[PDB]
Amino acid sequence: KFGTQERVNNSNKKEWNGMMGELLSGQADMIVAPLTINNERAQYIEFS
Amino acid sequence: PALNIAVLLGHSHDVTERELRNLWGPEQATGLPLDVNVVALLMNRTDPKSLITHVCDLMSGARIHGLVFGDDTDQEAVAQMLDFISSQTFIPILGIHGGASMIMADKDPTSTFFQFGASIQQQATVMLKIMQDYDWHVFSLVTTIFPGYRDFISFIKTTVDNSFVGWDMQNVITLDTSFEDAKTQVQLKKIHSSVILLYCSKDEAVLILSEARSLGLTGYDFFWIVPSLVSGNTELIPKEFPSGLISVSYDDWDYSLEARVRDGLGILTTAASSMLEKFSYIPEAKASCYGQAEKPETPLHTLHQFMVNVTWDGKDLSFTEEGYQVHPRLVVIVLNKDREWEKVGKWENQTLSLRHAVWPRYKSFSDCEPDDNHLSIVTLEEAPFVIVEDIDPLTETCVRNTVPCRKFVKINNSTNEGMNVKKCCKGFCIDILKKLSRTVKFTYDLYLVTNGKHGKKVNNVWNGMIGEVVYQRAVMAVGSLTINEERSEVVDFSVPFVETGISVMVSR
Amino acid sequence: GWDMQNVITLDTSFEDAKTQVQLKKIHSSVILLYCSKDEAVLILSEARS
Amino acid sequence: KIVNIGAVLSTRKHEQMFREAVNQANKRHGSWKIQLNATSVTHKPNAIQMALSVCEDLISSQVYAILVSHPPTPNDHFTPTPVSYTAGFYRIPVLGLTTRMSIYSDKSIHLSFLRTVPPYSHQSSVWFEMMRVYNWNHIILLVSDDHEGRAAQKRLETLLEERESKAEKVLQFDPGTKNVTALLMEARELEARVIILSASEDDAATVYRAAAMLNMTGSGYVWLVGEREISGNALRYAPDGIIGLQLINGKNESAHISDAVGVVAQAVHELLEKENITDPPRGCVGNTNIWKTGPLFKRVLMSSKYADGVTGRVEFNEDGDRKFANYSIMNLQNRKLVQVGIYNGTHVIPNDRKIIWPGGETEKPRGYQMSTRLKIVTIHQEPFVYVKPTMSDGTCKEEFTVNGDPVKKV
Amino acid sequence: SDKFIYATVKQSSVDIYFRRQVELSTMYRHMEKHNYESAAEAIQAVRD
């Protein structure tokens, strides 16, 4: 998965999966991928 | 093995010790490997010395392995008193009524004290559930230096940050002191028409509401949702409280004291059965409160991990790690025009059910300006103009370019009544209505028509659109309304915004 | 193409419930005020607050 | 006319000089209008004994305020908790002489409690000044899962959000955990080199031992901790170069007793000039009603500023806790404790002593080290990211484009 | 309709985009029940 803001089953907490799920969790710190720039993803992480 | 539980009440309630003992008489094998010898007691008044002496006497004499305390007064300190007693005696204590039912924040880690109540967090959760159900996304926040306000603001900020609903939080107000003197009016003056969440004490709530009314913050379009702490004692209502104050509280009407005690003893019995089926045997109580026994006093096995997963006969009364009900019994009440707390909604198994699908307008005060910009609007589902859909499974609210709209759907053909389900309406006519509301600056509560179909005069009585509008049940009829001679005679029509004649459809 | 949104009349006192919701209806950047100096002081102080 | 004040203290001589301080306060304020009587109770091992004794001796004596200190025994497991509850029944104010626990700061738990000593949560603010002085922006937290660690973390985040900055990670551990190597291992891979600890003595010693075993006490790292982490057993295993905090008069019972007696006498004199004053309840048993003027006297204590105190200017914040305290910033050099500066109520002032950071170097270390090994995440996209199974040798066959140039592969 | 079926990669930029528009929401409801896990799988499905 590239990444999508999704609700988790418990406590209805927002989370990211895929690239930004790994990135916001500290597992990765930079992404080289065909990642489209949009409003939703730019709010939490920054794009060159 | 026999398990001893003491039940302590006050003289305010009419329940006697014999009735308390008979409450443990179901006789369908409640505890498979164990039987309970419940002992009852009544106390004149609650205070530290008498309370500790009584609990120590019950522990030493009956060798009780548990205790359920039902308080009559509204003194909050008895909660911490019972918590301290539990910490010093390792006896599982349950809070039922009165001061034992009002919540303290952080329990001792080594104390087995559980309560029949909900934290400020659950109260805030049901506030936001009310707000989302009525689509009051825009709101403000005014608080005081009353303890627990930091936790409340942190929880609401976490919730708004982690919710897909828009939740347009305007501002946060924290009145330290000198409400009517200075440095407080300027903050209160910048809250616009929205929901104002107030968290303070009742005595401070009176002053806050007086200041708000003096500043004109208590209009028809102002809704205040407040916790049980400001509502407090139901029977007393200060004159400063305007009608329409939505509040959430632990139910004291339906959930009676006898049911309270039965539930508490059931939780204790279920925990005992669980520990028996898991561990070896019930640990005997402590030797005594006094004497300063030279021992770590920590039992090898305790019930603390066993009330987390408890299921009674019909209900699930499980507790959290810090000691809150997973499914607490919360009711949403409002101050009606009769100046009395009347229940509206209820919170069962993480689901909020409201009696009123649409929020009725409440006159805050006798001198309040009459509601004129709020109009009752009817509509009928038409394929190109009025499309009606269910609620969004994702956001649990009406999506963009849609408006709330209640449909009176019957349970079944057997009954002669139904409930109002809040669906979402969109389309050409709804878009026109949105533009009309934006321009003319009027508010609406759209609702589907269920009497007729597009209007018809039968037996000199109009149904549908014309019937609803003529009998003063609505202000305007927005929808696929064909302008007709009889309709124009009966009601007044606007300028036609689209040509709608009669035509023929045939197969090619 | 003037944009005259609304006309505001302060008939009652400037500190009661009225003339507070009435003033909050002002969303423009330009306000045409007409009164005497003493009432002007009170209205301007209320607007500043 | 006579006014009773209860003071549960550790030793006989403590209540003796408490009585002397009460007499001095009566002399300085004047006993012609009100005579300030003094009653005291000695500590007992059992908390139930505390609960019964405060009723039998203190409440029955119609006291106005209660002064509580720690027992002579080094154990301090919530010693003032019983009395603070019992006098909280009638909203009777309790003065915390030397109780530095942050659980008492929660006003919704202890209905009526005051103290002249700051808790274990305010040090974070002092730590903030460090990041303001030494220019540190990335911070590592090692708070515990108890109420102390949660309160410290909450206050630190509340103070940091004013800077619009947040701790990079907040590592949390249960109290009394023998093995904490996993959390420090997680902290090693991170970028920040500013480590903050807020834990008990045993937990601090355990985490220090684990970090020393992981070479986290060398050059390039900085350790900033509180008072528990540089006192007792935690000092035994504490690596050199750590920075701690020490209150000037945290363990001085006499000065706290004197200033508390003075401030409560001043507040009593201020209150007794008002109207409709209600006498305190008499007897623990038979009186279930709270003191009507109890909250009023608590507020009078709350806004009272004692002029000339031995410990300094006595002032209480909105939480009822001591404000504007002087902290001796503590540095561990060659296994010896030396003062490297003092922090007043607002600002930190260094001294002639030279600070020795861990590792033996003297210059101020950088807040973090820029990690040059970036963790890269990528997905399989055919036109952009080809992925192929590797061969048996650990790589895959090299390939050349139409121009003959080899393809760059990872 | 039920005869013409079109979909895309589940949990990607295009899903967020189609969820965001106000007019296309209806076809987004046709879109959610056929989303593929990866681009290659969708390309193969179109191929056959």
UniProtKB/Swiss-Prot annotation, chain C:
Tissue specificity note: Detected in brain cortex, olfactory bulb, hippocampus including the dentate gyrus, striatum, thalamus, superior colliculus, inferior colliculus, midbrain and cerebellum (at protein level). Detected in brain cortex, hypothalamus and cerebellum.
Phenotype upon changing residue 37 to A/R: Nearly abolishes inhibition by Zn(2+)
Cellular compartments annotated: Cell projection, Dendritic spine; Cell membrane; Synapse; Postsynaptic cell membrane
Subunit structure: Heterotetramer. Forms heterotetrameric channels composed of two GluN1/zeta subunits (GRIN1), and two identical GluN2/epsilon subunits (GRIN2A, GRIN2B, GRIN2C or GRIN2D) or GluN3 subunits (GRIN3A or GRIN3B) (in vitro). Can also form heterotetrameric channels that contain at least two GluN1 subunits and at least two different GluN2 subunits (or a combination of one GluN2 and one GluN3 subunits) (in vitro). In vivo, the subunit composition may depend on the expression levels of the different subunits. Found in a complex with GRIN1, GRIN3A and PPP2CB. Found in a complex with GRIN1 and GRIN3B.
Domains as described in the record: Contains an N-terminal domain, a ligand-binding domain and a transmembrane domain. Agonist binding to the extracellular ligand-binding domains triggers channel gating.
Summary of the function given for this chain in its UniProt record: Component of N-methyl-D-aspartate (NMDA) receptors (NMDARs) that function as heterotetrameric, ligand-gated cation channels with high calcium permeability and voltage-dependent block by Mg(2+). NMDARs participate in synaptic plasticity for learning and memory formation by contributing to the slow phase of excitatory postsynaptic current, long-term synaptic potentiation, and learning.
Family named by the database record: Belongs to the glutamate-gated ion channel (TC 1.A.10.1) family. NR2A/GRIN2A subfamily.
Name of this chain's protein: Glutamate receptor ionotropic, NMDA 2A
Gene symbol of the encoding locus: Grin2a
Parent-protein residues present: 197 to 245 of 1464
Swiss-Prot record, chain D:
Disulfide bond entries: 55-284
Coiled coil: none
Location in or out of the cell: Cell membrane; Postsynaptic cell membrane; Synaptic cell membrane; Postsynaptic density membrane
Homology family: Belongs to the glutamate-gated ion channel (TC 1.A.10.1) family. NR1/GRIN1 subfamily.
Tissues expressing this chain: Detected throughout the brain, in brain cortex, cerebellum, thalamus and olfactory bulb.
Protein name as it appears in the record: Glutamate receptor ionotropic, NMDA 1
Glycosylation (residues): 37, 179, 215, 252, 276, 326, 344
All ranges on the Extracellular side of the membrane: 1-410
Domain statement: A hydrophobic region that gives rise to the prediction of a transmembrane span does not cross the membrane, but is part of a discontinuously helical region that dips into the membrane and is probably part of the pore and of the selectivity filter. The extracellular N-terminal domain (ATD) is a site of allosteric regulation to modulate overall receptor function.
Quaternary structure and interacting proteins, as annotated: Heterotetramer; the NMDAR subunits are modular and harbor tiered domains that function in concert to regulate opening and closing of the cation-selective ion channel pore. Forms heterotetrameric channels composed of two GluN1/zeta subunits (GRIN1), and two identical GluN2/epsilon subunits (GRIN2A, GRIN2B, GRIN2C or GRIN2D) or GluN3 subunits (GRIN3A or GRIN3B) (in vitro). Can also form heterotetrameric channels that contain at least two GluN1 subunits and at least two different GluN2 subunits (or a combination of one GluN2 and one GluN3 subunits) (in vitro).
From Swiss-Prot, chain E:
Tissue and organ distribution: Detected throughout the brain, in brain cortex, cerebellum, thalamus and olfactory bulb.
Modification after translation, per record: NMDA is probably regulated by C-terminal phosphorylation of an isoform of NR1 by PKC. Its phosphorylated state is influenced by the formation of the NMDAR-PPP2CB complex and the NMDAR channel activity.
Domain of life of the organism encoding this protein: Eukaryota
Record's subcellular location: Cell membrane; Postsynaptic cell membrane; Synaptic cell membrane; Postsynaptic density membrane
Positions of glycine binding: 13
Record function comment: Component of N-methyl-D-aspartate (NMDA) receptors (NMDARs) that function as heterotetrameric, ligand-gated cation channels with high calcium permeability and voltage-dependent block by Mg(2+). NMDARs participate in synaptic plasticity for learning and memory formation by contributing to the long-term potentiation (LTP). Channel activation requires binding of the neurotransmitter L-glutamate to the GluN2 subunit, glycine or D-serine binding to the GluN1 subunit, plus membrane depolarization to eliminate channel inhibition by Mg(2+).
Stated family: Belongs to the glutamate-gated ion channel (TC 1.A.10.1) family. NR1/GRIN1 subfamily.
Domain comment in the entry: A hydrophobic region that gives rise to the prediction of a transmembrane span does not cross the membrane, but is part of a discontinuously helical region that dips into the membrane and is probably part of the pore and of the selectivity filter.
Name of this chain's protein: Glutamate receptor ionotropic, NMDA 1
Organism the protein comes from: Rattus norvegicus
Name of encoding gene: Grin1
Range of the intact protein held here: 676 to 723 of 938
